[PDB]
A = this chain, B = another copy of it.
């Protein structure tokens, strides 16, 4: 930026290596960053009481899997409490993942704040004091961060104020992260409220992504040292029209290549409620698109990698091998369907 650049050559280089190594060889991201309430909601499906010990146990099973998981998982997103826990043997989770070669990341948003004068749409809190938190995390073996911005499709939604505020919050987050050495993961998530179709979701996603990357350019954010976590362009789950993997893949790649620059090293997809098989098939169809796709499309999956694991665990011991294999199978399936090599 001539006289006042945001980063230096070393910082840009380090950010690019981190961002590329997360998605280096078809690898994805395990999103084990659920909060206390989110993890309680996930645990309620298998009649397991929500407590810190259960979260520690399940995350220990997730992070103590066979060492051939760096071939399918390149990064793990964590929560603040989960990063500092210990396994049963007495070493840190962030070190177990580090010796496996998996890159470590942290959730960095503090939540939602109502936006007055708007139809139930919010902005994201977490910006004040984020630089110190990011510096502490970078000291504490964390290489990337994640920030989620929710934009809803409803009557008069998303408004110009919501789009502008969310895009600028994501851009300021990303600039802070890159200033502290962390790779930012922008997650502009478009959630439909009323009934809609594929074309409207694609249009709104294109608008959101255009505003997001315009804000990122405005804040001088290094695009080669950041990742994108968008939702796949789908419809409301309470809709008669069920879209095949081909139509979803065409819609999402069409939305992405119109708005997302080629400087972004990789686009890791979220789930947002899709089944594991549907997410895998959709991502496989995404990677089989004839469109340019100048990025490394991959997965940043939550429930999709932790649905059979929860069912196999049940909150009980002696199911460690079953949970580890259930997570192994889903990780391998998504890694296969991150290069268009899934049957």
Which residues of A pack against B, CB within 8 Å? 1-7, 110, 113-119, 123, 125-129, 131, 155-156, 160-161, 164-165, 168, 172, 175-176, 178-179, 196-197, 199-200, 202-203, 206-207, 210-211, 213-214, 217-220, 223-224, 257-263, 291-295
What residues of chain B lie closer than 8 Å to A214, measured between beta carbons?
210-211, 214
**Cβ 8 A contact of A125, one of B110, B129, B156, B263:** B129
Shortest distance from the beta carbon of A123 to any chain B beta carbon, whole Å: 7
Q: How many copies of this chain are found per oligomer?
A: 4
What are 29 A-B contacts with C-beta separation under 8 Å? A1-B117, A1-B202, A1-B203, A3-B200, A4-B118, A6-B116, A6-B117, A7-B116, A114-B131, A116-B175, A116-B220, A117-B175, A128-B128, A128-B129, A161-B219, A207-B217, A210-B213, A210-B218, A217-B259, A257-B262, A257-B294, A258-B263, A260-B261, A261-B261, A262-B262, A262-B291, A262-B292, A292-B295, A294-B294
Contact of A116 among B155, B179, B223 (CB under 8 A): B179
Between A165, A168, A206, A292, the greatest number of chain B beta carbons within 10 A of the residue's beta carbon is seen for A292
Contacts of A5 in B (CB 8 A): 117
Q: Which of A2, A3, A123, A206 has the most CB of B within 10 A?
A: A2
CA distance A114 to B176 in the complex (A): 9
**Contact A206–B197 (Cβ < 8 Å):** no
CA of A2 to CA of B206, assembled, Å: 12
- With known contacts A116-B220, A128-B110, A220-B117, A258–B258 Cβ distance under 8 A: no
